């Protein structure tokens, strides 16, 4: 039987690209989404058109709350129900918006930014491990985590927590043969709420080609880490940033 | 007149030593505490006996919840109520216990470990900044954050988030002349819950002196960072670890 | 036309595995060596018997001296002379022995350790760049660089410098399309006549499998980095260490 | 009896400020210099006036060569000959100039940049240890080491090696009671060769006050690390950068 993967926030953009590349590599996939239902089902349709019974969807909010653990357990369970196994978890889904220190309440900002970027990854990691082969987890980190965006403190705190999870879970799950790694983009697919002049501002900062990464380039590094060529790699975070993090102010 | 400082979890151990040193340097202090009411009240009394009405107690659970923002605003408020100003915030309070990936619920563990180590610090930081010469914040970090204790994922995640806050907040509050730094103990005062064979193992690991740091040694770095000798220092985390973090497995 | 690579210290152990693996992917290779002449020529023979005119040797001492720049230029020249091009440079040669702070002179220890691990890589990088598709350089780093072996200060200095080269050259050569990355082993092929006690100690410290990396596992990360699957990756160092670097003392 | 310190490159700028602050703190000082002979004797004169026989000069080139170890030995010996003891070594002297990868020879560039920033510090550290209370060494590092200046690869390699030396020497000298730490400026005293256009560009990048650090501000951090308030601190590098290293491109 083919191995199976859960990719969170996989309806669009980088997660979709990762689910496609995993599917093309031979994986069956759980396409987790929150609001992008049409895009999710549309993607599952297409992957199933290529290989029947190889893709399902799973809806969940990954905001922190007292039921997040049950939601994360259900995501992993949905993979076992569909495919009878769960070999790969990709923690991709991410809330991203400014939260200045000086519409949403602060309680909600905390719950969304810390829940999606860190706590859900942790609970998903727990459920993945408890439900248990080249088993691995890839976390989508941030190459700029030590040179953060102005006024993105909660988002940055989440991404730093995710580095911590990557390290602590690599350490703890190693005896079980589960590898835990990260992929850290710089600028890749640019936010939709961003004008051309802003996009060119960011592009111009990247030493290697003065362009953003394609979603597929981020996916390539994911594919490497889950592959048999990375069987001794755990606790490593691969930057896929074109040198951006190397550039001083 | 004299500056004022909030120290969280200041009733005992390291937070106490920090509150005392700040007080001996001339600060008025808010002694925050959670359960240790006798030790807290007793400490404010000892300090007030030295200098009249230079200390107040303030109780608050710093576990994450929908009331945590109000709680943190009230801690900062209590410093302004008592002293008319708030020059220094020290984020010291911390829950610390194992949370294995494989009698508290996971959601309580998340709330306590991430709340105390990261979320409360962010909220205090926000409140501190909104209420605003040498203003500064000192976050109690962890020298071993990249070599974490087995099965302490949530704690480590919290301490990573706290690095992120330290960096993000230094960047964002610099324009208001608020510095934000960290002090990172290795092993200092050893926990009550730890075994003797484990206690001595830790001491022998320390290159410098094969002993743990005193609470006072930790405090000395806090005093340096809040002083006028640290006026251009922001976004820095000083390890006070006797070389422990340099030691391989 | 097949791409060509220079691998330094390619006669044995990890460098040999890298040469073999690049040759298997379709590269012609220059096998650089210092003293292991028989192994180097035996490797070249084997690779040429596999595909004709795809392997040569180049001998050079990579000790720091006033002739080092010419030696490094000669190494890069030898690829162009045999193959007409040079697409990949792998900086793998390394002196490794203790240099306590308290038979070789210190002058020689500095020359050997800093020369092989840092300055030769830098000179080689300069010669490679100046002579210029998918061009890259991979530097063999050290996952334990921040938790060094006791009394190995010059070696550790060399490997830190090599990080700095990796970053600095990534930044400077990105406009030319030359990527510069690192692979950082923990414990791999265990040095000859290490005791069974010692080896076993090291193995038992590795979280993932309690075993050292095979030279091939180190080579797999090199191959990935040179590949078209790493096209946006520059200035990244990938640890291949089984989680060794995550393990506290 | 007054303790004694060696400060390399102390005739001018930051090393001067450090020697001055050490002397004001009670130390006798060896003012090492290379070309700035008049500045150096002018400083020893100014200090000796305040306190008789408490300052001497010592001329030495700290370029790498086969006699560099003798030169570093003699610097240390100059402290013993003048003061009977040597308690503090500050590695401040530094060559700084671009060395592009694509009229000094490269040999000379390597010797000057690696010698002054790394090898001389190693050899000075060796001699300090071997020639032997509150003994310590402070290395002047660089807060921007992971975000290098374009075309400054050799300078950057040397500063990375100096991080490595700080860590390795901290580990190895801990048992002997010698602490080893760093201070990492961002932008401080602006080079004399620079024009007020370019100076302002640098100043504008600094979040904490849009200004370079003062030499005294750097010196303040050195004084803290040599003091009894840093007695458990070893292997720590304190950034004094005004948040500059936290600012993305
Ligand atoms: N794009 C970049 O340049 C960049 C840079 C650095 C790091 N990264 C990281 O790479 C990963 C992918 O980036 P991206 O730009 O593709 O991400 P994105 O479009 O910003 O987010 C991916 C998905 O996250 C899901 N999500 C958001 N909030 C959620 C919630 N409360 N509960 C459940 N799911 C939620 C959304 O699902 P629905 O659409 O279904 O609602 C969204 O499609 C992220 O972790 C990101 O942080 C990206
Ligand atoms: N000890 C070490 O060697 C070491 C090593 C690494 C890092 N650190 C860090 O340095 C700081 C001080 O260390 P420590 O050993 O002194 O800390 P600790 O004794 O373990 O905790 C200090 C205080 O935190 C408060 N706290 C715990 N949970 C709380 C909650 N839910 N709400 C509010 N307050 C809470 C407690 O207050 P009450 O007693 O009033 O309930 C406690 O006295 C901590 O941030 C710690 O993470 C210490
Ligand atoms: N093995 C591990 O566990 C490990 C751990 C961390 C990092 N690494 C890094 O990974 C790389 C490969 O490791 P390894 O164990 O295979 O290395 P190695 O066998 O110790 O040395 C590789 C080669 O370096 C060459 N060399 C040594 N001194 C030289 C000199 N003065 N001039 C020219 N070449 C010289 C030697 O060539 P000849 O044999 O031809 O004389 C030797 O075969 C190294 O850069 C190492 O530092 C390895
Ligand atoms: N200034 C900054 O903004 C900044 C930024 C980052 C790091 N740092 C570090 O902080 C330290 C001080 O900075 P700075 O600007 O004061 O340094 P600097 O003025 O550039 O150099 C200090 C001294 O180094 C000595 N030196 C240069 N080449 C030498 C050689 N071949 N042999 C012996 N000595 C030599 C010189 O002595 P003579 O004049 O006597 O010849 C010089 O006065 C340096 O280590 C620097 O890298 C400074
Ligand atoms: N979930 C999510 N996370 C993101 N992080 C970044 C980002 C953060 C710091 C530095 C650069 C990019 C981005 C980002 C992507 C392109 C340009 C700017 C920011 C991003 C995003 O679009 N979605
Ligand atoms: N709040 C709180 N945080 C702590 N962190 C540590 C610690 C964590 C990682 C490595 C070493 C010490 C400790 C700790 C203290 C002594 C020995 C081991 C761990 C500690 C603590 O007692 N209280
Ligand atoms: N050239 C060269 N470099 C090496 N570095 C290491 C090493 C260094 C620090 C931590 C672990 C391994 C090693 C090393 C390899 C196995 C066990 C211990 C050290 C090594 C080597 O054999 N050759
Ligand atoms: N010896 C020596 N080292 C230096 N390093 C820097 C520096 C390096 C990287 C980033 C910022 C400053 C500088 C420097 C100082 C001010 C402006 C730009 C660079 C500097 C210097 O003047 N002398």
XYZ file of N, CA and C and ligand atoms in Angstrom, chain A residues 13 94 96 142 144 149 155 186-187 189-191 194, ligand 5:
62
model
N -1.899 27.615 -2.076
C -0.590 28.205 -1.928
C 0.450 27.119 -1.603
N -1.192 28.320 8.890
C -0.616 29.475 9.611
C -1.434 30.727 9.497
N -1.354 34.668 9.946
C -0.333 35.683 9.718
C -0.953 37.078 9.594
N 10.294 29.682 9.419
C 10.375 31.062 8.945
C 11.866 31.380 8.970
N 13.208 34.114 8.690
C 13.446 35.458 9.224
C 13.102 35.594 10.697
N 9.482 40.822 11.245
C 8.640 41.930 10.814
C 8.203 42.804 11.997
N 2.940 36.392 15.945
C 3.296 35.508 14.829
C 4.735 34.993 15.014
N 11.893 32.120 3.143
C 12.075 33.564 3.309
C 10.856 34.307 2.758
N 10.923 34.748 1.511
C 9.691 35.120 0.803
C 9.483 34.137 -0.320
N 5.593 32.549 -2.187
C 4.339 33.097 -2.761
C 3.885 34.315 -1.957
N 3.767 35.464 -2.626
C 3.515 36.735 -1.907
C 2.030 36.925 -1.450
N 1.772 37.566 -0.270
C 0.377 37.685 0.180
C -0.515 38.280 -0.896
N -1.332 42.329 -1.203
C -0.083 43.054 -1.399
C 0.025 43.566 -2.842
N 1.320 32.171 7.035
C 2.103 33.055 6.419
N 3.284 33.363 6.938
C 4.110 34.240 6.350
N 5.297 34.653 6.820
C 5.806 35.534 5.954
C 7.022 36.121 6.194
C 7.394 36.404 7.517
C 8.598 37.011 7.855
C 9.493 37.375 6.860
C 9.140 37.109 5.540
C 7.933 36.497 5.220
C 4.891 35.715 4.932
C 5.154 36.590 3.906
C 5.274 36.210 2.582
C 5.646 37.106 1.562
C 5.891 38.442 1.878
C 5.771 38.840 3.197
C 5.415 37.926 4.179
C 3.818 34.871 5.166
C 2.605 34.576 4.603
O 2.158 35.064 3.558
N 1.750 33.654 5.213
